[PDB]
């Protein structure tokens, strides 16, 4: 009977919560209080990328840390040469209402989708030289919120259908569906090994998934509201999570717990997008209030602010080289930030 | 700058020229979001404008007086609206279609309208109210088993406004009902917005051909209001 299952669910929830509290010997803030604080991080808009006709939802750096897709609700993907600001490609989209894109780690493919539940895979390395749709991954029953390539043949997808799916692009079929969420899945970060991923899903829960096992291994639930953004820490053992609750939270996979909350009283709006730096020492979070804050992930201090956008920030990619953070906004502009010494 | 780097800049400029032609089309096109419950008959508004001029979004593109309108009916999405609705910041309007006859779901439609209206990302987006199924409202008021005052105790206090221009042969009970439903949406419309966005009620039926004309006129008077506000004229 439902009441007995509800009581068993509450009991197991209390067992999980007790095991977490039992392994909460000390907070991250206590361990890092001896660390010298990071100085005032200043980043200086080394590039502004212009050509999108509308809001940008998403970006993704190439592994080359030089090419950059951004998806705009104009209905264009643009491939940017960041070093030159050159447009490498502008890809017309069948649906304007794009909400995610991913650049493949090989750079052979780019993916995008949105309010049309298709995940379109675009082949950049085409012998005809035009970019073309290689596969329309159709079978999602709600909007495509995040996509990330594991390999040129495999993409994991997240949807407004409270679901994730791994696809084999050769077939266009879900090789695994991930179905333990209850809200709209909003963001997806692949682990550095690409064996695990975390997704945050409008239920204030993050879930760790095993790509091969098809199963939820951990649910992390420190957030108060919709996790809009998720990013693995570069060690792959922790990940950060930006919420509508105006807080970022860092979760360790293994301690199964929130390590720190990144919040300040002056900040009362949702975190739109999250990325770590290459060391993990800098945690960058984009906000609805038109700017991106930099957090000391260890000390939870605002090391700085990227205050250069005019409309809602929407996406936030750090290069795999760490040489820059790119910031996209609803103002159609696409800003690349480093600093100087 | 090397010969290849120069030629890549020239490709970037070729792309920027195509993107400018697309800027011309994107600004010449007016984008609309069509919202409404399963009762609303938004599907019939679509069918009208389609004929006469697992997919998650249904574009309808129609033209009135050489002006291109793209109207997006939300397709196969879940009933959790709050995330995908943020895509429609920078539409010209949201056409909110209401089933005026469905009093038990009229409060549901009012809470939807109030949520759409008060959303941070729609704070600048005006709403075209299609109060639809007005034939069925007239029938339900004349064949008056269903009493609005059972659902809206304000209706017993409400009196038809001097604004009201009922069609000839309309019973004043049908007028009082339909204008009450309108003012139930307008009391939401008028409670916040600081003039950044406005609400444009229309009484509609499926048989109406003039819904495209209504949308044309409302989009005109929205862009007019926006510019007159930018010019400190309104």
């Amino acid at each position, epitope marked *: 009977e439902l009441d007995q299952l*509800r009581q068993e669910a509450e009991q197991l*929830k209390n067992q999980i*919560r007790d095991a977490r509290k039992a392994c909460a010997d000390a907070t991250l803030s206590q361990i890092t209080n001896n660390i010298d604080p990071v100085g005032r991080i200043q980043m200086r808009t080394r590039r502004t990328l212009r050509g999108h006709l509308a809001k940008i939802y998403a970006m993704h750096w190439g592994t080359d840390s030089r090419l950059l897709v951004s998806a705009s609700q104009d209905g264009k993907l643009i491939i940017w040469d960041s070093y030159t600001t050159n447009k490498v490609h502008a890809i017309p989209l069948r649906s304007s209402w794009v909400m995610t894109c991913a650049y493949a780690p090989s750079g052979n493919y780019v993916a995008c989708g949105g309010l049309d539940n298709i995940c379109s895979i675009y082949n950049l390395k085409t012998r005809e030289g035009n970019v073309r749709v290689s596969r329309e991954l159709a079978g999602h029953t709600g909007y495509l919120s995040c996509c990330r390539f594991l390999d040129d043949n495999q993409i994991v997808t997240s949807s407004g259908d*409270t679901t994730c799916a791994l696809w084999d692009i050769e077939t266009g079929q879900q090789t695994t569906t991930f179905t333990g969420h*209850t*809200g709209d899945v909003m963001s997806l970060s692949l682990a550095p090994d690409t064996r695990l991923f975390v997704s945050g899903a*409008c*239920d*204030a*829960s993050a879930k760790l998934w095993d790509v091969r096992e098809g199963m939820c291994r951990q649910t992390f*639930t420190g957030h*108060e*509201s*919709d996790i809009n953004a998720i990013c693995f820490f570069p060690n792959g053992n922790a990940f950060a999570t930006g919420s*509508d*609750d*105006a807080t970022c939270r860092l979760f360790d996979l293994r301690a199964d717990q929130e390590l720190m909350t990144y919040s300040h009283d002056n900040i*009362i*709006c*949702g975190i739109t997008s999250v990325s770590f730096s290459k060391s993990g020492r800098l945690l960058l979070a984009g906000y609805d209030d038109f700017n991106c804050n930099v957090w000391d992930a260890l000390k939870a201090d605002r090391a700085g602010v990227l205050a250069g956008h005019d409309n809602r920030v929407s996406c936030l990619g750090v290069t795999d080289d760490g040489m820059a953070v790119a910031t996209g906004s609803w103002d159609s502009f696409l800003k690349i930030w480093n600093g100087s010494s | 700058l090397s010969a290849e780097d120069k030629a890549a800049v020239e490709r970037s400029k070729m792309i920027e020229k195509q993107l400018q032609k697309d800027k011309q089309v994107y600004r010449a096109t007016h984008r609309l979001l069509l919202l409404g419950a399963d009762n609303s008959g938004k599907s019939t508004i679509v069918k009208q404008m389609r004929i006469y001029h697992t997919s998650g979004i249904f574009e309808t593109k129609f033209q009135v007086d050489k002006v291109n309108f793209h109207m997006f009916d939300v397709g196969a999405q*879940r*009933d*959790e*609206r*709050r995330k995908w*609705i943020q895509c429609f910041n920078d539409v010209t309007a949201i056409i909110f279609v209401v089933d005026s006859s469905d009093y038990n*779901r009229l*409060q*549901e439609a009012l*809470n*939807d309208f*109030k*949520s*759409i*209206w*008060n*959303n*941070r990302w729609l704070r600048t987006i005006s709403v075209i109210l299609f109060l639809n199924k007005q034939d069925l409202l007239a029938e339900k008021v004349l064949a008056g088993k269903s009493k609005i005052e*059972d*659902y*809206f*105790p*304000e209706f017993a206090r409400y009196t038809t406004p001097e604004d009201a221009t009922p069609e000839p042969g309309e019973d004043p009970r049908v007028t009082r009902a339909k204008y009450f439903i309108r003012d139930e949406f307008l009391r939401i419309s008028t409670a*916040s917005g600081d003039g950044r966005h406005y609400c444009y009620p229309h009484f509609t039926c499926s048989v109406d051909t003039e819904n495209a004309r209504r949308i044309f006129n409302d989009c005109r008077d929205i862009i007019q209001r926006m510019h007159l506000r930018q010019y400190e004229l309104l």
Partner: nanobody
Amino acid sequence: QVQLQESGGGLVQPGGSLRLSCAASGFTFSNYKMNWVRQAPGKGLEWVSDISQSGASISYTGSVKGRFTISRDNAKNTLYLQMNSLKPEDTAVYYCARCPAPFTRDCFDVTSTTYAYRGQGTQVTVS
């Protein structure tokens, strides 16, 4: 963890009263507008009342407007519904439903068929 243990239901006679209570835990209660939501047998998931995070602004469906008082204890993170003049049509599961995001005036999804920031629900049966 966001959880909403709604309580205080049961059987009641027509014309009786119930004080529904909703213990809010894990979400800094007084940043969020709060709602009561309802599902009559075989009906949709009707909204019934709303209270702003300060308590200063309130609304009701009209079908309940004189009969239901929504109330709010920000210090004890508890939402209340003093429903004081019940009738059979009020017979429903009552769900304490939180607004999605803090500081928002809109609450899109509080009636959505699945919605995460809403309680288990309280059975109210009116004879």
